[PDB]
């Protein structure tokens, strides 16, 4: 259900400068439970890694911190 026409969009759309900050803010809620800190290529690599991370059971996925929905 990611490439199935949906009435509205749901995701993280921002310029490189803003998404850089939002990625760090998401990591601030992601670091407490395991994600290592990453102290326009770094941003794309980090976003791809977030998107690739898979769902462990019914728990909301890792990208849900950035996209801000449990249906992701």
């Amino acid at each position: 259900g990611a490439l199935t026409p949906a009435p509205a969009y749901c995701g993280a759309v921002d310029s490189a400068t803003k998404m850089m900050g939002r990625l760090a803010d998401a990591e601030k809620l992601l670091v407490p439970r395991g994600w290592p800190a990453f102290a326009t290529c770094g941003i794309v690599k980090r976003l791809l890694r977030l998107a690739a991370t898979e769902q462990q059971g019914p728990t909301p996925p890792a990208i849900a911190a950035l996209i801000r929905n449990a249906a992701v």
Binding site: L30, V31, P32, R33, G34, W35, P36, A37, F38, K45, R46, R49, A52, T53, E54, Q56, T59, A62
Partner: protein, 746 residues
């Protein structure tokens, strides 16, 4: 005209350690006896001892320690509000201190024994125990217990932990926390600590937001558990009447705490608050606030424990998990307490003998032996194995193989050699610690609690006295020599082993089983009798009569390394694998895969040219690797399953600066660090300490392209051993993981 009573001592704790006037090199120590008479009624008692400097330096093993240092440590431990966690400075100091005070208690006052009948006296003019004697009348009351749960959120600043871990790198994180409380005791004043001690009479529960502040939730009372007792005493050290407050444990006897999430800081904080509350009012002496455990040392320790060296005087036993057999481990902890006087596992190897009296006993035991073993001891170099065995690349079968073991041979031999050096000891009464080891060895087959004690008391004793290793391994070398000599007579053939455990083959026809049992039993009889005869000739006498265990009969056996052996009895399909490291939850699945692949590959005894069998074996081994990596994918997200237990000795991944934020989770780390290698971003593989983060965990995908490589490495070691051991050599089984099935994860 001395008073006389009938009681059983339930605990022995340290109240005061003082240096009397006109004294330079001997300190007095007051001991609190928690005595209970028949039907459980408890009266508190006290005794005094006098430890000299020489005894301290003997139980320490070095002369660095002094009487002034011990008295200063005791004075610092007098007040827990000013400075708790005193043992953390020099843990060996307090270890030796408890050892010597118990030894002097045994010597001067007499024989003591926890949870056992004991006739006790006292001198009213002074008011202390004068002499303890073993009694022989009374069905003593059962050692009742109380279940304790305590959890505290001690807000320790992470950066302090990071700095203290930077000063000493491989510092177990519980030691880091504990040092943080020690350097800032005010942190133990503010914590959301919750305590629930359930007993058989009345329950007691308290809850705090700040520890000093009054409870935000009460239940029962402090008085239901404790009977605060004010006792007057006139020690030889203190001419003036000195009053002591003690917390007599009515209703219960010892504590039972779950070792699953046990926090030594939590109990330390709770007991510090109790100490402050009870000894707030003056006009009386203050006790010693000392506790020991594996969390109190930089490198940690194997067995969880929580020593109670002083306040409150109640032993507390941590029983880790083991829910199915919780009563069994509670009884084991109680027995370990009662037998070794509660020193174990806190005092260490000093329960038996002072660490420095051992250099004498070992020398005194090298003399009473036979002339041959006298040299055999002196020519022992680490891992000599002077016995005809198999080349490590080799395999045998189908021939009737059998594994044998002497249950507890190192412990029994140590006991016999300790008795050989017993005459060489300075004090005949100083051989009571040599009676606990015989009690352990005698009761080892009857009850397993003595076992785990002996599998740690003995290797640690061998580290206390390096010279004892060359004695024990020489006596065991002599045992192996007679094993080999007797083996030829009963058709047995030494093929491998490690001393007490040895596996071999039989020169009987490999098809008959009715007479196989007879030869396998006669070999056991003859080897046991011959080894016992050599030990008797070597003067070494064992308390429990020697017994050989038939640990399995097998038809095929294959060995690759010095410890790796796989045995398989085709008739009943019973197998045994050793030498494969179980360093995690995935290694167990790997071991099962190996033990099935080997069962299928030695089932290829169908008549074929050896060359054909090598290929139809390598194909099956590659297929087993395939089925293992395929199943690995279905558990790629279970980071705990792909976890490795790193020891505090092995090279370890560097701790992420956010693992120092686990709160009441850093305390669980005592020995092992469970690490999983995850792959954030790309290219870089970083280690995550699994048990230092709250659950459920969120992580980047686990780098199975690292763990599976090591698991496969050891699988190829085993498979190269079997391939080059049954059929023709020359084949190193390698699985092309990087090409065939690397894509699944990377």
């Amino acid at each position: 005209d001395i008073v006389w009573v009938e009681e059983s001592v339930s605990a022995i704790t340290l109240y005061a350690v003082w240096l009397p006037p006109r004294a330079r090199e001997y300190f007095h120590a007051l001991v609190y006896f928690v005595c209970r008479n028949a039907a459980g009624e408890g009266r508190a008692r006290f005794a005094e001892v006098s430890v000299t400097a020489t005894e301290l330096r003997d139980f320490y093993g070095s002369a660095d320690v002094s009487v002034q240092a011990v008295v200063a440590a005791a004075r610092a431990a007098t007040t827990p509000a000013a400075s708790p966690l005193e043992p953390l400075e020099n843990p060996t100091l307090w270890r030796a201190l408890y050892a010597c005070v118990l030894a002097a208690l045994e010597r001067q006052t007499g024989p003591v024994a926890l949870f056992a009948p004991l006739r006790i006296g006292s001198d009213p003019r002074t008011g202390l125990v004068v002499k303890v004697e073993r009694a022989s009348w009374g069905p003593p009351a059962a050692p009742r217990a109380a279940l304790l749960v305590a959890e505290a959120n001690i807000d320790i600043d992470p950066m302090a932990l990071a700095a203290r871990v930077a000063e000493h790198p491989d510092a177990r994180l519980a030691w880091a926390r504990l040092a943080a409380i020690r350097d800032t005791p005010q942190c133990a004043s503010a914590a959301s600590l919750t305590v629930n001690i359930t007993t058989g009479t009345a329950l007691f529960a308290r809850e705090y937001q700040t520890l000093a502040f009054p409870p935000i939730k009460k239940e029962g009372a402090f008085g239901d558990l404790v009977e605060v007792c004010e006792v007057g005493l006139r020690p030889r050290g203190h001419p003036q009447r000195v009053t002591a407050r003690v917390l007599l444990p009515r209703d219960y006897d010892y504590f039972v705490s779950a070792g699953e999430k046990f926090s030594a800081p939590a109990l330390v904080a709770l007991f510090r608050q109790w100490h402050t509350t009870v000894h707030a009012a003056p006009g009386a002496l203050a006790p010693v606030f000392a506790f020991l455990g594996p969390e109190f040392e930089v490198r940690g320790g194997p067995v969880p424990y929580f020593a109670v060296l002083g306040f409150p005087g109640w032993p507390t036993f941590t029983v880790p998990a083991t829910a199915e057999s919780a009563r069994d481990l509670v009884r084991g902890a109680a027995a370990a307490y009662a037998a070794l006087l509660g020193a174990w596992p806190a005092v260490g190897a000093r329960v038996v003998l002072p660490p420095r009296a051992w250099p004498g006993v070992a020398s005194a035991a090298a003399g009473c032996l036979l002339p041959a073993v006298r040299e055999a001891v002196a020519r022992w170099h680490p891992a000599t194995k002077i016995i005809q065995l198999l080349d490590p690349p080799a395999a045998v079968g189908p021939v009737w193989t059998a594994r044998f073991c002497f249950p507890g041979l190192r412990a029994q031999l140590l006991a016999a050699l300790a008795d050989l050096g017993g005459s060489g000891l300075a004090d005949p009464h100083g051989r009571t610690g040599l009676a606990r080891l015989d009690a352990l060895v005698v009761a080892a087959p009857s009850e397993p609690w003595a076992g785990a004690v002996l599998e740690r008391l003995v290797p640690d004793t061998c580290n206390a006295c390096p010279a004892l290793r060359q004695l024990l391994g020489g006596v065991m070398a002599a045992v192996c020599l007679q094993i080999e000599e007797t083996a030829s007579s009963v058709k047995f053939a030494v093929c491998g082993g490690d001393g007490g455990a040895f596996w071999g083959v039989f020169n009987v026809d490999p098809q008959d089983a009715d007479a196989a049992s007879g030869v396998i039993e006669d070999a056991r009889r003859a080897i046991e009798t011959a080894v016992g005869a050599v030990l008797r000739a070597n003067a070494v006498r064992l308390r429990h009569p020697l017994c050989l265990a038939l640990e399995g009969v097998y038809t095929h056996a294959v060995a690759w390394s010095q410890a790796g052996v796989w045995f398989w009895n085709s008739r009943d399909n019973t197998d045994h694998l050793g030498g494969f490291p179980l360093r995690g939850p995935a290694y167990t699945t790997a071991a099962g895969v190996v033990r099935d692949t080997l069962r299928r590959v030695l089932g290829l005894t169908t008549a074929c040219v050896p060359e054909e069998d090598a290929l139809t074996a390598r194909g099956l081994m590659e297929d087993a690797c395939d089925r293992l990596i395929l199943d690995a994918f279905n558990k790629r997200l279970d980071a705990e399953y792909w976890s490795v237990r790193v020891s505090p000795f092995e090279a370890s991944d560097p701790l992420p600066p956010t693992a120092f934020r686990g709160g009441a989770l850093l305390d669980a780390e005592h020995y092992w660090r469970r690490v999983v290698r995850v792959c954030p971003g790309g290219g870089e593989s970083v280690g995550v300490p699994v048990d230092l983060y709250p659950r459920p965990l969120v992580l980047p995908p686990v780098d199975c392209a690292h763990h599976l490589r090591e698991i496969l490495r050891e699988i190829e070691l085993v498979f190269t051993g079997v391939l080059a051991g049954v059929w023709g050599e020359g084949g190193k089984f390698v699985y092309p993981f990087d090409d065939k099935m690397s894509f699944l994860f990377a």
